[PDB]
Design a protein around this ligand. Sequence first.
Ligand SMILES: OC[C@H]1O[C@@H](c2nnc(-c3cccc4ccccc34)[nH]2)[C@H](O)[C@@H](O)[C@@H]1O
Ligand SMILES: OC[C@H]1O[C@@H](c2nnc(-c3cccc4ccccc34)[nH]2)[C@H](O)[C@@H](O)[C@@H]1O
Ligand SMILES: O=c1[nH]cnc2c1ncn2[C@@H]1O[C@H](COP(=O)(O)O)[C@@H](O)[C@H]1O
Ligand SMILES: O=c1[nH]cnc2c1ncn2[C@@H]1O[C@H](COP(=O)(O)O)[C@@H](O)[C@H]1O
Ligand SMILES: *Cc1c(COP(=O)(O)O)cnc(C)c1O
Ligand SMILES: *Cc1c(COP(=O)(O)O)cnc(C)c1O
Lengths: 810, 810
Amino acid sequence: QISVRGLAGVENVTELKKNFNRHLHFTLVKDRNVATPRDYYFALAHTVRDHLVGRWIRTQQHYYEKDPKRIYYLSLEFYMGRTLQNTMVNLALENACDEATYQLGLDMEELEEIEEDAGLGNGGLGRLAACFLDSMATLGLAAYGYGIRYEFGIFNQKICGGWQMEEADDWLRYGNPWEKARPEFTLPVHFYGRVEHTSQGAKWVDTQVVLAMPYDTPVPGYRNNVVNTMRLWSAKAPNDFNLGYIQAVLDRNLAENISRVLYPNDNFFEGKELRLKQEYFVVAATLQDIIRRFKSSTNFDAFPDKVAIQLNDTHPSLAIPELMRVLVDLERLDWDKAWEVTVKTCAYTNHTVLPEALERWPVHLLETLLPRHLQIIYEINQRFLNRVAAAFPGDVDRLRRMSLVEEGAVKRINMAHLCIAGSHAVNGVARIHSEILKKTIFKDFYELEPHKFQNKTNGITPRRWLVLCNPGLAEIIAERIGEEYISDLDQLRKLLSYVDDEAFIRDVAKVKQENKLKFAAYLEREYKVHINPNSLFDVQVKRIHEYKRQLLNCLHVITLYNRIKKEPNKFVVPRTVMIGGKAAPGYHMAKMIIKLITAIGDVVNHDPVVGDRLRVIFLENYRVSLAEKVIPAADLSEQISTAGTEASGTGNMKFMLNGALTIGTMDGANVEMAEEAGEENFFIFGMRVEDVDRLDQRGYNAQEYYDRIPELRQIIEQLSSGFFSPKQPDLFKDIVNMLMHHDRFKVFADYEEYVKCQERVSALYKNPREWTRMVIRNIATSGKFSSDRTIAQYAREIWGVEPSRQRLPA
Amino acid sequence: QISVRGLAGVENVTELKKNFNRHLHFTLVKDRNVATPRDYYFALAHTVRDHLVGRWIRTQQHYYEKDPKRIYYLSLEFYMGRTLQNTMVNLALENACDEATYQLGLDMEELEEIEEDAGLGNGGLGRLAACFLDSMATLGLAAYGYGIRYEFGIFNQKICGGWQMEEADDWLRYGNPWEKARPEFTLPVHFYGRVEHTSQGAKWVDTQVVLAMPYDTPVPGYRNNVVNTMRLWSAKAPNDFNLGYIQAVLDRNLAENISRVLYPNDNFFEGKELRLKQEYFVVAATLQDIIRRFKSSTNFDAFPDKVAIQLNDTHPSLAIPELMRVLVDLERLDWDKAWEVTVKTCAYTNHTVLPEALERWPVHLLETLLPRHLQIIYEINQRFLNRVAAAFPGDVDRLRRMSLVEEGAVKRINMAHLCIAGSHAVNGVARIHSEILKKTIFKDFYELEPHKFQNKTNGITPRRWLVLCNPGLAEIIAERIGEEYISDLDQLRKLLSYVDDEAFIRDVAKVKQENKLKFAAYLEREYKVHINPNSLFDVQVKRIHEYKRQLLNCLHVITLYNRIKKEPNKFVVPRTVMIGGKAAPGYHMAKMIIKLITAIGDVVNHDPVVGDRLRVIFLENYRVSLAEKVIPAADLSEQISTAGTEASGTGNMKFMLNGALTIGTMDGANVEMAEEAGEENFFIFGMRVEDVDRLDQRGYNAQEYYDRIPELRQIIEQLSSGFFSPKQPDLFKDIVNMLMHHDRFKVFADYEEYVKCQERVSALYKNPREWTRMVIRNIATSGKFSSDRTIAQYAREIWGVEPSRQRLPA
Ligand SMILES: OC[C@H]1O[C@@H](c2nnc(-c3cccc4ccccc34)[nH]2)[C@H](O)[C@@H](O)[C@@H]1O
Ligand SMILES: OC[C@H]1O[C@@H](c2nnc(-c3cccc4ccccc34)[nH]2)[C@H](O)[C@@H](O)[C@@H]1O
Ligand SMILES: O=c1[nH]cnc2c1ncn2[C@@H]1O[C@H](COP(=O)(O)O)[C@@H](O)[C@H]1O
Ligand SMILES: O=c1[nH]cnc2c1ncn2[C@@H]1O[C@H](COP(=O)(O)O)[C@@H](O)[C@H]1O
Ligand SMILES: *Cc1c(COP(=O)(O)O)cnc(C)c1O
Ligand SMILES: *Cc1c(COP(=O)(O)O)cnc(C)c1O
């Protein structure tokens, strides 16, 4: 079919066919006469899995013999999505399998659609972890992902009457062929109890035990025969647990609840006990595993030469005092030596700046749950503050600002402070974010230890986010510059020499149009909704939060609507405006925003005077598999967070790679993206960070904008008076109230510039040749945003290991 | 090695070896350098499972094409034990696998010991269901076992300080290679709600839904290529269940608790709501499955020609009103037609006579949980009592005696009464039990409908209970009369012509001695306990209950002890007395009996004057896999229930088949066993049923026996005064009090005859040649007690289908 999908050699195809039939018969216990498409999917998945395992066993064997430094990536989230196609791509099996299935009378694309997303994350942070695992394997690093195997991942979103409803994501219902249970490597985790001081140091006693059972999933690198491991822990009760009889057995559920469900909140901290248990559970089990593997190569001086532990935000921050606990209490190292080892082993990545996102755990929770860890934390704090006092003598306010312990009605532990003190490296996730960290929020820490602070700008894997989801674009690129760019994305820069090539312009535009038709058809089939596929596809997909300003997009949409109603017989560039994303279940304002988006659509989409010129669509249940469909179909990428709020973004990079132009603020990685493509090839608008600060100094008054902008005033009057909610006229009064009086993200302040910038987008879209030339300039400069680049930087500058592009033997 | 284990042909051995290595590598994801014995067990189990599936698919295919009448065996318990060896035996693979494993450097016996018992039953009733499935497959019947897949089966028993402790039996921890999840065939079950009457009949509405997910296990027949199915339901919550968010997801456990744990009570009724839910759950899911299979061959007149439903006691009795509900409410048949179909479809097996074992559910429970079923039950009752009134006019007391509804403080439904009314056949499980049913407890029902009442004496499968557990005995038998007896156990009668053959006498005695050495070694290894293997092995293994009279055995043991202490230098036949069995967790007296047994052992086993002449051993954690070891090692089988209390017994039959002599009362199947072997070849003692009745008429006074028997008086004084409990002198006062004042099972009344009969056993054991000749006479007449015989009788006399010994093609 296409070149970038590998060879379909006669013998490979024959062997895949016979193994497919072997798994259908023996593994699934089905004959051909009763097998459903789901059975056929599983037969294929098992067939493809068999090609992994030889490489998996060999890879892990090689690491045991060579004993390289090991990288442990600790995260509460891994948003993996589907595995079947990714595995085929990485093993060069895609064309052989397509042919093998074709010859059995099956359509492989249809079978790929049956696979559940592994939805073990909320959004950007969890998906970054997934991209990183892919890049680590592709770069030959001896890396392990460690997390929790949630029984229920991110909820499935249904819209009922324009409102979000949540349904449990029962992703394991039909089984997971990709994982292997390893109950033989089960480990104990302790909770509660009390601390006893003896002659022989501290002892943690009278604890409740929960077992941690590992499940291993293979992580294949791109065509290098390397298969790394993601190890996810599941919670099990011990068999003497509570041991009338019947009730004791049913109460085992209380222990197993720890790994039941992913907390569905992106960028907001909720201090629940169950969440703290999850955090300790993953840390405690993972560290025992790390230490046993280190001992099976008494001396912990070499520990940091053999182990790096990367903390994906503060969620696994308890790794720091847990490592200290093990080294001091169990291994009997003195404090100072243990601390040296811990700091050199641990590194911390920060992913936010909103004060409500920082983890600050009440002391009373830690006191009850993890009394030994609280003691270690106080000791860490005391020694740390002795260092601050010696460096800045007399600076008493600095001491309370830098403390790990926050004073107040409730005493709290600031986990970010703990991470900085206990790590040899601290990094933000985009250059502007890393600067903000050292200038404002961790300024005091930066002055004490400037050498700790780094930047590692985020990236995305070009395997999933180009080759897999946009094979048409990958192919036309491969026709011109070959295949090496897939594991060296900087080679896309060669495409600048095709910017005036008429054939390439035609092909880039044709691929986009095919992707748009394919997506428009998908909308009709699965959701009974029609769209004009010649319209500009204006897409904002990401989790729903105020700082992302889905509401600013809504204001633009209503502006275009009002303009059309005012001058119906004037030409305007047709648009399909698509907004998608999940709201956290407890977040009232985010749920109201979803309702507003669907309410706008109810008016706009049924106005006969609008025609097919404007459509507003809420994309239901946005998730990794839906991103793989909509991103290649997009013309315009909306990246419109208030400057200083989006730490990086990664969706922005996915769109850039797939031939959409970007409208956005100078926020997060948008700054670096514009810098790479040239500002003239980007639709930049709005306040910069400095402009936001100036506004905050004199005070943001929304009323001033309302008074000066007639078009904005009209929209606020329509919202208030019930134009978009005739049966419930006051339905949106909280939104209006927030915008006029309590808007932290300054929606009105960027309105005017956003609308003007949107007119420039429309003007360019009228000239397809120039639109497409600007697209080529974006794709061609997207190379920096490969996660291979990000990971190579972590490896050299933080972990002290060298990446490799060498094949292991097959 | 031995003939009855099949051929080890060169090509079979080679293919097993290559498949073993394929499963180790691909299925388990292990190399040889890190594999443990457990891994090797799983590799073997998967290798053997592959040979099942072709036959399994073919068998189910054949039934779909031929459309024979289908037999559905409904039970809350299936006590399957281990599967690996049984599967090898039934497929003629045992020698090929032994050789294949031997050539890979592995001992297959060692790998067999790693397998968990599937302990989904309490004792005799659950194990009968398992034997029956084996016989049904061996006789070529299109039969399905339907039950519940409990997450936790019968508890593991630990003895701590002589007391029973219970531990959860986490039998699925490492996976079950024998089952196949079928989530595609998941079905809804309804609970709670209310009934609405319309023009179009009754509607059950506002119900809570629990999903029933089936797991299928293969059941191979003996060398006939037939593989039937056991389908076990597991409980799952629907995904909209309760749908703050987090709590709704955690509350899914409430629905899934239905299939969490087996109720661990043998022969005692506890009316718990969770138990009633389990009973309806299995019935509701099973009936939908039955009906869909019937529709996929509008007319229910043929239903009883295509379906038989056998009820294993009253536990699935709700099948009767559920079948009526479906036919009347959903299919819209008139009542009388639906009733005709139901009665002709259903049959009921009774397994007890103790009034406290009968299921009598409070009306308020049924009213809340299953309101439509309660309505149907009242309607059934009304119509049934109209028939009684017409047959016996004026007999007002008969009407209240036969009612399905019992009056009292709490109104109750008598489920046995429902079963009799709603079934075309009612059977007991041994001739004396079936007679008792028609003379006393169901006398009124027998007078109304004598044609319903039958006997089907229980049996045991000779595959598990001879070939598998006692290969040495199977072989010496096969040397003389061939192999056909394994599926036609009446052929053992040919062994009577060897009763005077010196070589056969020698070989029978040698096999027993080997089994005893093998068991004595097993005791030393796994439990650090030494036993004289030349002693008589006196074994009582069964669940602990007062009616089984483990206490009568205890009194004998203390009598022998006191006799030795009185005349130390006199010869007595050495004995190892072994008592084993689990007590129901809430049953105080049964737990006290276990403690008494261990306390006796603490005195007897450490008395230097006793020497190796007497040992008392409590066999911990008695279960199916332990029965397979101890039963072939036994010399004397203790079957000493009070006459009229053991409905049948099946342990008794296992011992008979394996070369133990029986000491017992004329109770249950013991009567038929003595009748088959001749009373002169059996150690019968004690009151018959008639003698018990005579005692009850004039009143049982235990004090009379105490006053007349000095030896008995001495034992009661030792118990009371703290001889067996020096640190707690009054520890056994409840046992003494019960024996003297409140003994329903008349332990003292059989004491004298039991002790005299035990002296006759000892006298015979002194003459090994005559002991062994009596053994040959027992084994030779054990043919009636094959479950193949039992099942053939069910098939012809109840189900109306003909058994077959024909092979399906391989
Ligand atoms: O670096 C990858 C992404 O991490 C996101 C994030 N930042 N914090 C979280 C987050 C995820 C899950 C649970 C949380 C709980 C509390 C606070 C933040 C989070 N997610 C940032 O908002 C993005 O700008 C960034 O591109
Ligand atoms: O026919 C097979 C066996 O069934 C046993 C039984 N009889 N009732 C139960 C029973 C099992 C499980 C749960 C129960 C709950 C209440 C009452 C009885 C039971 N088990 C009888 O006691 C045995 O004599 C008989 O050999
Ligand atoms: O003692 C050993 N001998 C040989 N190989 C080992 C040993 N321990 C670990 N390994 C290798 O390391 C892998 C197990 O990885 P683990 O998760 O670090 O235990 C296996 O696939 C083995 O190849
Ligand atoms: O529609 C059908 N066509 C062919 N075979 C069928 C069909 N339905 C059921 N079967 C057979 O019956 C078996 C399924 O059993 P079930 O549990 O009764 O559904 C399969 O193994 C098939 O061979
Ligand atoms: C990339 C991705 C995100 C992150 O998008 P942002 O626009 O950076 O928030 C969230 N969810 C899914 C499913 C993704 O694929
Ligand atoms: C056969 C068997 C029973 C039944 O024995 P009885 O002596 O008839 O009560 C109970 N438990 C197990 C494990 C068995 O194998």
